[model samples]
Structures are given as C-alpha cells and as structure tokens.
Target: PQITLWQRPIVTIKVGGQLKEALLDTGADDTVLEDMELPGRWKPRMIGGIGGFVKVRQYDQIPIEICGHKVIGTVLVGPTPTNIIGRNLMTQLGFTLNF
Candidate 1:
C-alpha cells in the first residue's frame, strides 16, 4: 500500500488489544506512544522532540500490530502529543519512501 503526503501519513494500529491511530514518522528515530498500561519493566530515558526533551519510559520487545502486520520492537511511553511508529518498526515492516 502506497501512502501520500496529502495529509500526515496517519494510519490505524493495534496495540495491547486497543486500536490506535499513529503516525508513520520517517523522521523519528524510535517509536513513541502516549502513557499506557503495558505489562513489563521500563527504564527512564530522556528524549528530544521538536519542542524540547522529555523523560520517557523505555520498553523493549513490545509487540504491536500495524495495519494487520504484527511485529515486536522497542517503544517509549511518555507524554508525547500523539502515538508515533518510527523507522525502527517501519523498517522491519519493509516500508520505504519514494520521491
């Protein structure tokens, strides 16, 4: 499926049995999601976004179903403005950008 920049490249995703709409951000290095109840231990890590750097909880080996394609990867839980699926997971799903 090809996506265009007509909008924000937003899409639906399933995580922890809850479906969410997340952005497939090619610019972001890692995946980041808003605070949620995830079953696992997480470590504190500071991340820099467009506005400023904020502390986040890092969780690895977390599985998420993106548009029916399920894959496990590292994810950060914090007060992010929105849920974003970055290159780390996008690369595994074999998605690429074309100009």
Candidate 2:
C-alpha cells in the first residue's frame, strides 16, 4: 500500500519499547537505522555508510505490525538516512511492485 514509484513494507518497530512506523527498502543491501535509535537489548555497533560510518545494532526480535499482520523479528536499531524496506523482509512476502 504505497503511493510512490517505489514503496516497500512499512511497519511499526519497537526501540527501547517505543514503536515507530518505517519503510523496508529493498534497494539497500543491508539493514540500517537512522537517527541513532536504540533498543533495550542492543548496544551500539558502528558500520560503514556511503559518506561515513554510523552506529547500528543487532537487537532481539521486536513486534512489527503491517497490514493487520504482526510478526516478531529482529531489525537494525535506529533511523535511516532514508527509509528502506530491505530484502530480508520482502523475499518472505508475496506481492508485486507495479510501479
């Protein structure tokens, strides 16, 4: 359910127990978080970025709600340079990108 030329899975992710909706980007090869969001079970782990290095983390599975469907999965903790619906979550779903 997207209105743009490129749209992917959007879901509510919990960080430190706070949930926020984010887009899952297929274009991105890896999971990334922006705004340096932190989860309770995760610690800061830095990774390489296009321009420079930023912090990231591997957190325990959190609850994600999308399209009346809920799944518990682990995600990269933090905000992203831009929202991305990565391949990890997309390959599991059956849908079409007709844009």
Candidate 3:
C-alpha cells in the first residue's frame, strides 16, 4: 500500500496500545511524541524543531503501528506540539514522497 504525502501528511498511529494522530515528518530524523507516561528508563536528550531546541526523553525500540504496519524504533517524548512520525519509522512503513 502506498501512502501519499499531503499538505500535512497526517496519519493515525497506535503507540503503547493507545491510538493517536501523528504528522509524517520527512525532515525529522527521529519520531517524537507528545508528553505521555511511557514505561521505560529514558535518557534525557535535546531535540531541535522549527521554533527551537527542547529537552526530550529518548526511548529506544518503542513499539508503534503506523497505518496498520507494525514498527518498533526510537521514540522521543517531550513537549512537542504534535506527534511526529520521522524517517526512521517512515522507512519501515515504505513511505515515498510523490512530487
């Protein structure tokens, strides 16, 4: 199945048994999730975005299902405005941009 890139490229994803909406961000190297309670011992790290840099907790090998495709990878949790699916997970889901 092919997923097209929209103006926002928003997609529904399930993370940690919870369904949430996320933006497919090709520019981002790591998937970022909004602040949530996740089970793990995460190391504090910093991530930069459009506005500025922010501190985030990096959790390795987090299980997340994007558009029905099961993928497990690194997920960053922080004060992000929205959930973002980055290239790490996008490549697992076979995503391509059609221009």
Candidate 4:
C-alpha cells in the first residue's frame, strides 16, 4: 500500500493477534516495537537509535498486520517510546510513500 507523506503518522496496527499503533519507519530500515513478550525463540541484538545503542529481543517470522494488511517477518522488541515499522516489513507490504 502506498501512502503520501504524513508527519509521524500514527495508524492502528495488529501484531501477533494484538492491536496497537506504530509509526512508519519511513526513512529507515529495521522495525522495532515496545515491550511485548512475543511467543517464540528470540535472539539478543543491539541497535543504534537517537540515544546510541540499545539491546532488543529479536523474533523472526512474527505475524503482523499493518495499515490493513497482514504480513510475517522479524521484529525487534525494545523500550522504544512508540512502535516503529522498518523498511523490512514495508517492502513486503508494498508500503510506498507517494506524493
């Protein structure tokens, strides 16, 4: 799904049978979410954000529904202030930003 540029848009999302809102990682690759114990084997990974590097739990092939589409992929669970969808999922979701 293609969308026009919106300033930090907040849209409803569904992940692993859960519901919430996450910002589009518009300009970045790699998705992340707030603390939510996902059911699956996870790996310890570190990511650099505005505040430098932070640790996160990585889950692969997690079921996620964004905007109005359902998809499967890897997601990082961290203490982010809000949920963020990286290019990984967007590319699969055909999520394009149109002017």
Cα lDDT of candidate 4 equals: 0.85
Model 1 alpha-carbon miss at residue 2, Å: 0.3
Pairs in steric clash, model 4: none
Q: Each model's TM-score?
A: 0.96, 0.55, 0.90, 0.88
Q: How close is candidate 4 to the true structure, as a TM-score?
A: 0.88
Q: Where does candidate 1 stray beyond 4 Å? A: none
Worst 10 residues of 2 by lDDT: 62-71
Q: Which candidate, 2 or 3, would have the higher TM-score against the true structure?
A: 3
| Candidate numbers sorted by lDDT from highest down | 1, 3, 4, 2
> How high is the lDDT of residue 36 in model 2?
52
The Cα error of candidate 3 at residue 96, in Å, is 1.9
What overall lDDT goes with each candidate model? 0.92, 0.56, 0.88, 0.85
lDDT of 4 by residue, 16-97 (tens): 6788999887775789999987887999999997779999999999988887788889999988899999999989977666
lDDT of 2 by residue, 76-98 (tens): 75546454545655554443466
Best by lDDT: 1
- Total clashing residue pairs per candidate? 0, 11, 0, 0
Which candidate number has the best TM-score? 1
Give, for candidate 4, the lowest lDDT window spanning 10 residues: 1-10
Write candidate 3's Cα lDDT for 2-97 as tens digits.
556547778899998899999998899999999887778899899888788999999987889888889988999988779999999999988887
